[PDB]
Amino acid sequence: LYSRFPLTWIMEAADDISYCVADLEDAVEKRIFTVEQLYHHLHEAWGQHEKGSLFSLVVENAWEKSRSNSLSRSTEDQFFMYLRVNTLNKLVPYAAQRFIDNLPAIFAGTFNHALLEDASECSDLLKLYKNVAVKHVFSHPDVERLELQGYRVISGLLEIYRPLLSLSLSDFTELVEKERVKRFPIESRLFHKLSTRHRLAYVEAVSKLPSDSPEFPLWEYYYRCRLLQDYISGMTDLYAWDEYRRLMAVEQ
């Protein structure tokens, strides 16, 4: 109970590594700051500077390679290529070794740590990238507005489907059997917009319940909500934005 599958630690470490560097590269593409400004933001946030540290071996290395290269490569292409490679060459072997060194608990699935342990210098290099990304990229207004817009879109969608929840058991169930329910025109059509795969999982789950039990209405409601959360969470950003505008009548 509560044990993890051993390969999960590896995927978790791959997430931890790839979590940030790419977002800085994209930030330079979006002209938010120059590659030169990025190097100094990274130099500043590392603080305790030494000839020999990860910073020196990984990110300072990439900065020097980017200056005076053949292979007619862009400065930014060259900086980030070697920022990616240098980071991998240091952080992958460390993660692999950690996996092997703790293989008994990882195999049992009870190892209460990540591969890039929250202490290590490798985790410090990753924290370095996060610190810059947090203060200079994720704070960009265009990003922050998108976050504001998304929250209103998913919030608003749930209210549009609120009718399906503000219904009794016998009522919602009648809507599941009869396709056309005479007296519930809105809830009917709302029900049919839900993707077929999600309605099927609701019917399947509820049918496996004992019909007569006193907890049946509790289980039905749980599955009804799961039905809606399935429908919403299965959308793309653009589909969900589109449906929001459409069901508030604003597109043609």
Partner 1 sequence: QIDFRKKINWHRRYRSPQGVKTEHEILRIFESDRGRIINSPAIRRLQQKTQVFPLERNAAVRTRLTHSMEVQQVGRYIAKEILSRLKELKLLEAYGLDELTGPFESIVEMSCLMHDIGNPPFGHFGEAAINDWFRQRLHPEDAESQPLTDDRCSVAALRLRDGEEPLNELRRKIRQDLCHFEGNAQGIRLVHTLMRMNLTWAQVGGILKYTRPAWWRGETPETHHYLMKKPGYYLSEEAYIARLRKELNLALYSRFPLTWIMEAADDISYCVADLEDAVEKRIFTVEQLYHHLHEAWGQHEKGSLFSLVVENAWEKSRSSTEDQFFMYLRVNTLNKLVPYAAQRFIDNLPAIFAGTFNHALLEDASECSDLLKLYKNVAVKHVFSHPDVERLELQGYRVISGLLEIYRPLLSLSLSDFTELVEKERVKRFPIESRLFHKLSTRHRLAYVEAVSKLPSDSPEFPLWEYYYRCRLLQDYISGMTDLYAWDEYRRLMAVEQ
Which residues here bind partner 1, judged by CB under 8 A?
134, 139, 141, 144-149, 151-153, 241, 244-245, 250
146 is in the binding site of which of partner 1, Mn ion, none (Cβ under 5 to 8 A by kind)? partner 1
151 binds, among partner 1, Mn ion, none (CB under 5 to 8 A by kind): partner 1
Which of the listed partners (partner 1, Mn ion, none) does 139 bind, with a CB threshold of 5 to 8 Å by partner kind?
Answer: partner 1
Minimum distance from residue 143 beta carbon to partner 1 (Å): 10
Nearer to Mn ion, 15 or 251 (CB): 15
Number of neighbouring beta carbons within 10 Å of residue 149: 13
Least Cβ distance, residue 178 to partner 1 (angstroms)? 35
49 CB contacts (<8 Å, ≥6 apart)? 43, 55, 56
Least distance from C-beta 19 to Mn ion, angstroms?
6
Provide, rounded to whole angstroms, the least separation between the CB of residue 157 and Mn ion: 24
Q: Which is nearer to Mn ion, 12 or 36 (CB)?
A: 12
The smaller minimum CB distance to partner 1, of residues 150 and 234, is found at 150
Separation CA 62–CA 87 (nearest Å): 10
- Please say which residue, 1 or 249, places its beta carbon nearer to partner 1: 249
Q: Work out the burial of residue 197: count CB atoms within 10 Å of its CB; fewer than 13 is exposed, 13-18 middle, 19 or more buried.
A: exposed
Q: Which does 55 bind (CB under 5 to 8 A by kind): Mn ion, partner 1, none?
A: none
Nearer to partner 1 among residue 30 and residue 113 (C-beta): 30
Comparing CB distances to partner 1, the nearer of 142 and 179 is 142
The CA-atom distances, in angstroms, between 182 and each of 186, 187, 193, 225 are 10, 10, 17, 24
Least Cβ distance, residue 13 to Mn ion (angstroms):
12
> Using CB under 5 A as the criterion, what x/- string covers residues 4-33 for binding Mn ion?
-----------x------------------
Binding residues for Mn ion (CB under 5 A)? 15
